[PDB]
Amino acid sequence: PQITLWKRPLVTIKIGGQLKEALLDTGADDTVIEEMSLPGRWKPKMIGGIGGFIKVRQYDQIIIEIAGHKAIGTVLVGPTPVNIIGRNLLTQIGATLNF
């Protein structure tokens, strides 16, 4: 599938067995998910955006499904306003920007 950008590119994801909505974000290096209970070991990290940095929990090797595609990689969990799928997982699902 090919998405225009007239609306936010929101898709369904599954993480921790839960369905959620998230933004496909080519401008994000990392994947940041809103506060949730997620099993697995983690470590503290800061991540930055406009407005400055926030403290998150970094979980490595998390299995996530993104619009039906399975990916495994690092997921950051913390007080983001919007769930973001960034380039570390967009590359694993084969997403590209075309134009």
Ligand X SMILES: CC(C)(C)NC(=O)[C@@H]1C[C@@H]2CCCC[C@@H]2CN1C[C@@H](O)[C@H](Cc1ccccc1)NC(=O)[C@H](CC(N)=O)NC(=O)c1ccc2ccccc2n1
Active-site residue (options: 25, 29, 30, 60): 25
44 binds Na ion, rule: CB under 5 A: no
Q: Which of 26, 35, 60, 70 binds a second copy (CB under 8 A)?
A: 26
Which phi and psi angles does 88 have, rounded to 5°? -60, -25
Q: Please tell me whether residue 90 adopts helix, strand or coil conformation.
A: helix
Interface with a second copy by CB under 8 A: which range of 12-20, 28-36, 37-45, 57-65?
28-36
Total number of residues that touch Cl ion (CB under 5 A): 3
Burial label for 99, CB within 10 Å (0-12, 13-18, 19+), is exposed
Active site residues: 25
